């Protein structure tokens, strides 16, 4: 029956792990971009870290299915198009960008998928996310970096999605 | 310092050696150089003003130099006794 | 037309073509005799010894059909070492003095294959506004490339360029001021004591003794500072030590 | 300049594409694969891309000149192919210097060795 503005505070009382996992099922099966930013805000109100909850959604998006990849030494035997799962992967990001710290996290794992529409050959798709993608996000995380009071290594993941991130930008 | 020293005790630093050199060469003088720390920092800090931080540090430098002295001395009597 | 001939003659076209070397290696490609392809295009590269960009050309064309052929693996990584081994000898010719390439008005493409010999002194002559370390550890590097036929002794040519290098150092002239020591570190020659320790070179024993170094006349040309030879003396001899 | 991009694709700054400056100290096997197989996969395909490109605007010598930049051991091109990708590159090639050959012109050099 739906009443978000109640739904924060029994899953505050369940145990953290558990009430975050159905919390992030919950929040999956919310589409409307204005009724989820005030499920967000209801969450940091009640103490519901925002940040994981758009992880564990993405990560479960993404497990739901396994990967996507096509070769000749990894040939796979089944063949297979696009799918409304392809397209949830897809509307599964904004999550990320919603919030102030986690565009170095939704540029992560945009190239993470991005990697599976190549490989199985789904250039349009990449595009498509690709364009989703905002031009600031990239200063965003330097800017982050810098204010986080530390320049020292940024993580191999880190520079690894900025490197992979500039490349494919110059061959779309 | 060396060079103050040497200087204020009126020895020679000519343009082939400097003053710590002819100190170092010269080991019969080495109780010469002590009255030349004490009186090179009483005319540099007379020099210095009082509120100058490097007129402490000299201070400090010199009394660490000569109580490293001192004990590389009394260490080395103590040890090959 | 001559090569658009059918399969029952491309031998026979391949055997006429044995005198259009430049030529039948495409015929051999297309032929699918990879083998073959690549023993013309080792052979070409071998003979070509000029014009940079045919070189490099001739040099990758020789290792692309080294792996086109079905070789086993021990050959196609010998025939890679060597090849690899001639951009070696190649990177010296691509890290010229770019202003000096330009305002002489060559080419690396339009002026052929010069000695290590000619390289190594382009590199050092004065006229060489370059004054850096890379220039020095290159040229030393190039020795390597020199091989017993001699073509200039090795060892006073290694003086000639030690000298040099402690050429561009400065000095307190007339009487210094200052340690030879810690006063050189900032000096290039110094940088290359240390570069050649940490590529593994000795100091003490790769270094002139200071014998040969008061032989050695460009380093006998400066000895009007009393504090330059000096320096020279004691920074050789605590690093030799440092050394041994 | 369609030309230009496809060249700073190809030789852009800190070498390589799918070629990253810094290794995974978190080893991620994934990550891995998939790198090395969209390197494996698309490199041939834009290469032959740029070759098209150069055959049809007639500089044949520039579709020569990518035998080199792929022998680049900067970047590494030779590895990821295999051998029918670098065969059809090869006859690729061979076409190009074709039609510089028919013009009578050694394909070694500007001038004639033979």
Redesign the interface.
């Known amino acids: 029956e739906k009443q978000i503005e109640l739904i924060a505070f029994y899953v505050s009382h369940l145990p953290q792990e558990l009430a975050i996992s159905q919390y992030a099922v919950f929040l999956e099966n919310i589409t409307d971009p204005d009724q989820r930013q005030r499920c967000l805000e209801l969450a940091k109100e009640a103490g519901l870290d925002v940040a994981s909850i758009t992880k564990t959604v993405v990560e479960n998006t993404r497990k739901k299915d396994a990967?996507e990849?096509?070769?000749?030494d990894?040939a796979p035997a089944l063949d297979s198009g696009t799918s409304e799962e392809d397209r949830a992967k897809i509307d599964v990001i904004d999550w990320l960008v919603f919030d102030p710290a986690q565009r170095a996290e939704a540029l992560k794992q945009s190239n993470?998928i991005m990697?599976?529409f190549?490989?199985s050959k789904k250039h349009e798709a990449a595009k498509e996310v690709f364009a989703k993608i905002p031009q600031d996000s990239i200063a965003e995380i330097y800017s982050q970096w810098e204010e986080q009071a530390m320049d020292s290594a940024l993580?191999?993941?880190d520079?690894?999605a900025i490197?992979?991130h500039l490349?494919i930008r110059?061959?779309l | 310092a060396i060079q103050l020293a040497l200087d204020k005790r009126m020895c020679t630093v000519p343009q082939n050696l400097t003053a710590a050199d002819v100190y170092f060469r010269e080991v019969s003088q080495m109780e010469i150089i002590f009255e030349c720390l004490v009186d090179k920092e009483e005319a540099d800090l007379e020099s210095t003003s009082i509120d100058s931080v490097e007129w402490a540090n000299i201070v400090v430098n010199v009394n660490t130099i000569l109580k490293d002295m001192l004990h590389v001395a009394c260490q080395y009597r103590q040890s090959k006794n | 037309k001559l090569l658009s001939q059918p399969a029952s003659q491309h031998g026979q076209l391949a055997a006429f073509l044995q005198?259009?070397?430049?030529?039948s290696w495409?015929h051999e490609?297309?032929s699918q005799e990879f083998e073959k392809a690549h023993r013309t295009l080792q052979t070409?590269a071998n003979m070509?010894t000029r014009?940079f960009?045919?070189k490099?050309?001739?040099?990758?064309?020789s290792?692309?059909?080294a792996?086109?052929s079905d070789f086993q693996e021990d050959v196609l990584q010998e025939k890679v070492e060597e090849i690899?081994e001639q951009?070696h000898f190649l990177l010296h010719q691509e890290t010229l003095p770019k202003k000096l390439l330009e305002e002489k008005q060559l080419d690396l493409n339009a002026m052929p294959v010069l000695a290590p010999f000619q390289l190594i002194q382009l590199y050092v002559c004065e006229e060489n506004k370059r004054a850096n370390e890379n220039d020095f550890m290159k040229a030393l590097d190039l020795l390597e490339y020199i091989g017993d036929d001699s073509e200039v002794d090795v060892e006073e040519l290694k003086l000639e360029i030690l000298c040099k290098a402690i050429k561009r150092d400065e000095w307190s002239a007339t009487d210094g001021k200052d340690d030879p020591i810690e006063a050189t570190k900032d000096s290039i020659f110094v940088k290359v004591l240390q570069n050649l320790l940490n590529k593994g070179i000795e100091l003490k024993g790769y270094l002139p003794k200071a014998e040969t170094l008061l032989q050695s006349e460009e380093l006998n040309s400066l000895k009007t500072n009393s504090y330059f030879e000096f320096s020279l003396k004691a920074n050789y001899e605590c690093y030799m030590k440092m050394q041994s | 300049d369609v030309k230009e991009?496809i060249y700073?694709?190809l030789l852009?700054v800190?070498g390589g594409?799918?070629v990253?400056?810094?290794?995974?100290?978190?080893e991620?096997p994934?990550?891995s694969?998939?790198?090395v197989?969209?390197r494996?996969?698309?490199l041939p395909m834009?290469c032959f891309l740029l070759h098209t490109v150069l055959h049809n605007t007639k500089q044949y010598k520039d579709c020569?000149?990518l035998?080199?930049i792929?022998?680049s051991?900067n970047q590494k091109l030779?590895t990821v192919?295999?051998?029918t990708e670098?065969?059809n590159l090869?006859?690729k090639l061979?076409e190009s210097?074709?039609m510089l050959?028919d013009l009578q012109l050694?394909?070694?050099?500007y001038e004639?060795?033979?």
């Not at chain 3, 005198?19 to 030529?23: G, K, N, P, Y």
């Not at chain 4, 990253?20 to 978190?26: A, L, Q």
């Not at chain 4, 050694?106 to 050099?109: E, H, K, T």
């Open positions: 990967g990849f096509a070769h000749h990894f993470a990697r599976k190549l490989a993580p191999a993941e520079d690894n490197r992979e490349c110059a061959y | 005198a259009h070397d430049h030529l495409l490609l297309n070409l070509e014009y960009c045919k490099k050309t001739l040099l990758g064309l290792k692309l059909a792996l086109a690899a951009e | 991009k700073n694709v852009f800190d594409w799918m990253d400056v810094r290794e995974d100290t978190e991620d994934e990550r694969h998939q790198m197989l969209l494996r996969l698309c834009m020569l000149r035998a080199d792929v022998s051991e030779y192919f295999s051998k670098m065969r090869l006859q061979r210097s074709l050959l050694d394909p070694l050099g004639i060795q033979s």
